[PDB]
RNA sequence: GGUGAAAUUCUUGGAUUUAUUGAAGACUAACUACUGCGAAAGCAUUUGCCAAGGACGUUUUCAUUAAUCAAGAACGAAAGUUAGGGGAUCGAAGAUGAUCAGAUACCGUCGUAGUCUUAACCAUAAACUAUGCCGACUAGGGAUCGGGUGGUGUUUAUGACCCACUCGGCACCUUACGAGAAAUCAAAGUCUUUGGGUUCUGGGGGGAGUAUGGUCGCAAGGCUGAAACUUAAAGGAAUUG
């Protein structure tokens, strides 16, 4: 009746400055008409993207990131890291029979006025010179590794605002820390965190927002 | 310089439909189902009709001028079949055949934990 | 007397002149004597203190809520009810409240309301067991008891009933134009049988 | 006008109610090296030229 | 020496009113007249001048509570809900 | 038949037979 | 007559385990009785990798794989999978193929 | 939408899907097995508290205190009852659309009680290993859970893996000298070459768990229970069609 494809404006995004190439997405809003236009229309389109296009490599084909926009300016914006989550492929590719599963979850308040709920995940591989089929734990081992993983993870929180925590998570040094801390228990398997989520955006803070570009 | 969209395919039983959208997913663009292209009420899930509708969807998308797409397949999901439909492959086939770049494939059929007792009763749906 | 809900005498310090102003709040559940109480927008959240529902999160539970800002309390005072808030639209600062067994209402965000369920729950379940307690109860309220029927009563007291037999001969299911004058018996009753008639059935 | 041409190379098997549907793993001549499985009605010899109205369609089993 | 078998406290009414009625009245009246324990007085000396209130003898610190119990299940659960909500909005 | 519905029939007949005894005695 | 050695399924020293539904027939069965298999084939039809590579950047990208788990009920399993029965003694074998 | 096919229902008052979320409850999916615990019924999220458990180690301790069991009691799946919380899902009745000679049945869409929790009841099941408890002996073999002991063994001085043995347990393959009517049995064996202690239960099939009493339960019903009365077989295993 009106053919609505010619009633929107082609936009672009800008990731934070603590990553590689940022011009990674482009979307639509509305024409610059009246009655509350694109300048104040969306103001909150959450967007998904994997880490391959954000790091330049491809080994990060999992652990996709969800980003949130808040402020718009000069036909541009700047987004804050909202969270991340694994690809569904790797989960059911990793999980297999005749082994164990270990998990944990903690909700913490960082140094600054943010909160975050973090998850964990791990398995138990059989080492060399082994003939068993299962390689299971003893139920006290799981209780010990659970609390030590919880506390050694919380030690990274209470300090390191989420800005620097993003660059601490990108190289995955915390997994090597977990390995070094818990090698006394098992021969370990691929340790991951698999989920961060937030539920208390404390305030705007346009200063720290605009501090991530240039 | 490639502009990205998101397919977000829903491939359930007895029909199938798609709609391209922005990377955020706030503005769906060009939604087409089997009913848009065939009226018989049985072959709504036919992969032939699925491809016939995907061709028109790709044409309407190229009219706006979109290049790359992220395909995200989803079956009926939940406490149901947990299996994509028959047209789930012919959709991708026709979409890639109709001049459009594909990248970053993934499934998003949401696996649930055990809850919400499925229908059919204890004895289940019997013929 | 009369109202089955208890009440409590509260005291504040007037800000404009040296005086201790007393007031009568309805006694919600969980409060005790000698207790400190808060009021206003900057108050915390502990059962008993009153806040404006505009400045409290989604999913609280309040009683004695106001309908317009300044009515000084005008909704849900009886013994055995409360109300939950669902919506929060800051622009045109209204808010959706779910009166969960009969309505969904919109109220100005600055309206008054106290957190905490009203006291006296489960009161009605106790059977009266005899006419004397009903008599004493309605004594401290109204002269609308003992009730007496009209249709079964004489024809002069009810034209559509009375006489040798107990006849009716009228109709109950009235159209959208529920006129008056026939206001004896039923009025605008359409459906029958007790079932879950609402949105979001099961 | 996708009046495509294809040379039946290898008769695969036979299906159908009467056993009257001959399968083939054919590849079309113009820009070859792209294979698809078709189901012809009548008997087809080797290196048998053939025409097609459809561009892509796969139907393995047929009773 | 069992003064009765099945009727207990509500046997004063005699034969009138029925069975289920006075049984329900028993199951409510035992709770109505039970002697609970005030949290901030230590002892158990709560009595009633009228429904809705529970007055502790020693300490004299009364409480505006339920109809026939110091705390209904609705009160007990909404207290926990408000606790969760306060902790969420604060911390 | 099945013992399920056999027992059902007999148990209903039990109540039916005992019904008239109340009206009698 | 006691047909099979194990009465119904792998259950000794538990009495009761847990119920679970079928996907095809939706019958309710104990978790230990019926069928527990996996489907880890591919997210693709007849090849089409030529088309994918020619019409997609990032050549092949991931080598994608499908993932599912199946609990076929007792009747639906034998209906779909056409094997069902075995000899009076061959039932004792436990070969996957 | 939904089914084998269609129909019922919704649908320009924007339909299911699609992004921000926000609410009510049910549960702990994949890990999840010839694994574990419990007297059974049963028991799968993490964390704290509460007291209890079998196995293992013992050059500790008391010295027959023991096995089973009438009468007596505890515990007891689901459904159901009494009065409160919520009713998201599913869902006997019920309402409807299909199919059918008929279909209040299978199938499709809704849908009350129920489907959880609190305080009392009910004591039933193919409550299955259809194999009662305690104690000795008789064949072989490999895995596996827990505890324990050795190795001039492997990985960071402790944890983890391997090799030999041992105590207890869910179990498993072979062989059966033996038993059984056979299916099969490591006990269903150590039986006319008839006897280690001990409780309960049955004497052809139906009448029949029937009314009769008694007893427990507001109630669904629960426990004990021969007859009068008709009959020739019913019944278990396995062989050939
Ligand atoms: Zn006191
Ligand atoms: Zn199924």
Q: Which domain holds residue D33?
A: 1-63
| DSSP 3-state of C55 | helix
Query: What whole-number distance in Å separates Cα of residue A56 and Cα of residue A63?
Result: 14
Name the CA dihedral angle for C174, C178, C179, C181, rounded to a multiple of 10 degrees. 70
Boundaries of every domain in chain A: 6-214
φ/ψ of residue B45, rounded to 5: -95, 10
Burial class of residue C152, CB neighbours in 10 A (0-12, 13-18, 19+): middle
Query: What whole-number distance in Å separates Cα of residue A204 and Cα of residue A113?
Result: 11
| DSSP 3-state of B29 | strand
- Reduced 3-state DSSP string for E11-69: HHHCCCCCCHHHHHHHHHHHHHHCCCCCCCCCCCCEECCCCCEEEECCCCCCEECCCCC
- Domain CATH number, residue D32: 2.40.50.140
Do the Cβ atoms of C66 and C74 come closer than 8 Å?
Answer: yes
Q: Is A in contact with D (3 or more beta carbon pairs below 8 Å)?
A: no
Nearest to A153 by CA among A171, A170, A168: A168
Query: What whole-number distance in Å separates Cα of residue C119 and Cα of residue E50?
Result: 13
CA atom of G3 to C1′ atom of H182, Å: 14
Interface of G with D in 33-62 (CB under 8 A): 45-47, 50
Report the residue count for chain B.
127
What radius of gyration do chain D's Cα atoms show? 11
Do the Cβ atoms of B55 and B23 come closer than 8 Å?
Answer: no
Query: What whole-number distance in Å separates Cα of residue B18 and Cα of residue B58?
Result: 10
**Greatest CA separation for chain F:** 36
Q: Hey, what are A122's tokens?
A: 């791990």
Distance from CA of B3 to the nearest CA of D (A): 28
CA atom of B122 to C1′ atom of H54, Å: 37
Burial class of residue F9, CB neighbours in 10 A (0-12, 13-18, 19+): exposed
| DSSP 3-state of G8 | coil
Long-range own/partner contacts, residues C34-43 (CB < 8 A, 24 or more apart): C34/E61, C37/C10, C39/C12
B48/D56 Cβ within 8 A:
no
CA atom of F18 to C1′ atom of H226, Å: 22
For residue E47, the ligand closest to its alpha carbon is 1
Of C31, C61, C129, the CB nearest to E64: C31
Of G48, G58, G66, the CB nearest to B103: G58
| Count of domains forming chain D | 1
Provide the 8-state DSSP code for G82: S
Nearest to E40 by CA among E63, E22, E20, E18: E63
Name the strand (E) or helix (H) holding D26.
strand D21-27
HSE at residue A105, side-chain half, CA atoms within 13 A, is: 6
Query: What whole-number distance in Å separates Cα of residue C100 and Cα of residue C82?
Result: 9
Do the Cβ atoms of E46 and E35 come closer than 8 Å?
Answer: yes
Query: What whole-number distance in Å separates Cα of residue B41 and Cα of residue B35?
Result: 8
CA of C13 to the centre of ligand 1 (A): 28
Query: What whole-number distance in Å separates Cα of residue A67 and Cα of residue A47?
Result: 5
Helix axes B47-64, B87-97, angle to 10 degrees: 40
């Amino acid at each position: 009746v009106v053919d609505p494809f010619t009633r929107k404006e082609w936009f672009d995004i800008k990731a934070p400055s603590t990553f590689e190439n940022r011009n990674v997405g482009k979307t639509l809003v509305n024409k610059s008409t009246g009655l509350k236009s694109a300048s104040d229309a969306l103001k909150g389109r959450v967007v998904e993207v994997c880490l391959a296009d954000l790091q330049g490599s491809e080994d990060h084909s999992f652990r996709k990131i969800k980003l949130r926009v808040d402020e718009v300016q000069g036909k541009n914006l700047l987004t804050n890291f909202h969270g991340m989550d694994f690809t569904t492929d790797k989960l059911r590719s990793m999980v297999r029979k005749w082994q164990t599963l270990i998990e944990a979850n903690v909700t913490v308040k960082t140094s600054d006025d943010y909160v975050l709920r973090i998850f964990a995940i791990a398995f138990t591989r059989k080492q060399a010179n082994q003939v068993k089929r299962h390689s299971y734990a003893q139920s006290s081992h799981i209780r010990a590794i659970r609390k030590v993983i919880s506390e050694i993870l919380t030690k990274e929180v209470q300090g390191s605002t989420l800005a620097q925590l993003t660059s601490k998570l990108i190289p995955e040094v915390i997994n090597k820390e977990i390995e070094n801390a818990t090698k006394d228990i098992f021969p370990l398997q691929n340790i991951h965190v698999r989920k961060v989520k937030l539920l208390k955006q404390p305030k705007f803070d346009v200063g720290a927002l605009m501090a991530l570009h240039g | 310089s490639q502009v990205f969209g998101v397919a977000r395919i829903y491939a359930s039983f007895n029909d199938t439909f798609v709609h391209v959208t922005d990377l955020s997913g706030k503005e769906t663009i060009a939604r087409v189902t089997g009913g848009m292209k065939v009226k018989a009420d049985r072959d709504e899930s036919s992969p032939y009709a699925a491809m016939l509708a995907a061709q028109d969807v790709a044409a309407k998308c190229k009219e706006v001028g979109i290049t790359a797409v992220h395909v995200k397949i989803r079956a009926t999901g939940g406490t149901r079949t947990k299996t994509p439909g028959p047209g789930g492959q012919a959709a991708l086939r026709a979409l890639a055949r109709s001049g459009l770049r594909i990248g970053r494939i993934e499934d998003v059929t949401p696996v649930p934990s055990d809850s919400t007792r499925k229908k059919g009763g204890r004895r289940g749906r019997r013929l | 007397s009369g109202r089955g809900a208890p009440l409590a005498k509260v005291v504040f310090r007037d800000p404009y002149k040296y005086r201790l102003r007393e007031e009568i709040f309805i006694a919600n559940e969980g409060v005790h004597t000698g207790q400190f109480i808060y009021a206003g927008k900057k108050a915390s959240l502990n059962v008993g203190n009153v806040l404006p529902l505009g400045s409290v999160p989604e999913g609280t539970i309040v009683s004695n809520v106001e309908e317009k800002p300044g009515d000084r309390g005008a909704l849900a005072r009886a013994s055995g009810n409360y109300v939950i808030i669902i919506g929060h639209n800051p622009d045109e600062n209204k808010t959706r409240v779910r009166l969960p067994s009969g309505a969904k209402k919109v109220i100005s965000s600055d309206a008054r309301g106290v957190i905490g369920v009203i006291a006296g729950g489960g009161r009605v379940d106790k059977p009266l067991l005899k006419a004397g307690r009903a008599f004493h109860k309605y004594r401290l309220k109204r002269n609308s008891w003992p009730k007496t029927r009209g249709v079964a009563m004489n024809p002069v007291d009810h034209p559509h009933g009375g006489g040798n037999h107990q006849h009716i001969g009228k109709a109950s299911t009235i159209s959208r134009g529920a006129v008056s004058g026939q206001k004896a018996g039923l009025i605008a009753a359409r459906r029958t049988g007790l079932l879950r008639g609402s949105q979001k059935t099961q | 006008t996708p009046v495509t041409l294809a040379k039946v190379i290898k008769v695969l098997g036979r299906t159908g109610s009467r056993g009257g549907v001959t399968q083939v793993r054919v590849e079309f001549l113009e820009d070859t090296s792209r294979t698809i499985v078709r189901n012809v009605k009548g008997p087809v010899r080797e290196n048998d030229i053939l025409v097609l109205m459809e561009s892509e369609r796969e139907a393995r089993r047929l009773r | 020496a069992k003064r009765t078998k099945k009727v207990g406290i509500t046997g004063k009414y005699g034969v009138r009113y029925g069975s289920s009625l006075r049984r329900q009245v028993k199951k409510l009246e035992i709770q109505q007249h039970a002697r609970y324990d005030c949290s901030f007085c230590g002892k158990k000396t709560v009595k009633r001048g009228a429904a809705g209130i529970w007055t502790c003898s020693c300490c004299k610190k009364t409480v505006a509570g339920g109809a026939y119990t110091v705390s209904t299940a609705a009160a007990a659960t909404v207290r926990s809900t408000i606790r969760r909500l306060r902790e969420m909005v604060e911390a | 038949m099945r013992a399920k519905w056999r027992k059902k029939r007999t148990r209903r007949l039990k109540r039916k037979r005992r019904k008239v005894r109340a009206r009698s005695k | 007559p006691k047909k099979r050695a194990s009465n119904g399924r792998n259950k000794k020293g538990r009495g009761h385990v847990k119920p679970v539904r079928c996907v095809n027939c939706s019958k309710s069965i104990p978790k230990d009785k019926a069928i527990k298999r996996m489907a880890i084939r591919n997210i693709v039809e007849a090849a089409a990798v030529r088309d994918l590579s020619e019409a997609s950047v990032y050549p092949e990208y991931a080598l994608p794989k499908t993932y599912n788990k199946l609990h076929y009920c007792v009747s639906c399993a034998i209906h779909a999978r056409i094997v069902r029965v075995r000899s009076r003694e061959d039932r004792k074998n436990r070969a996957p193929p």
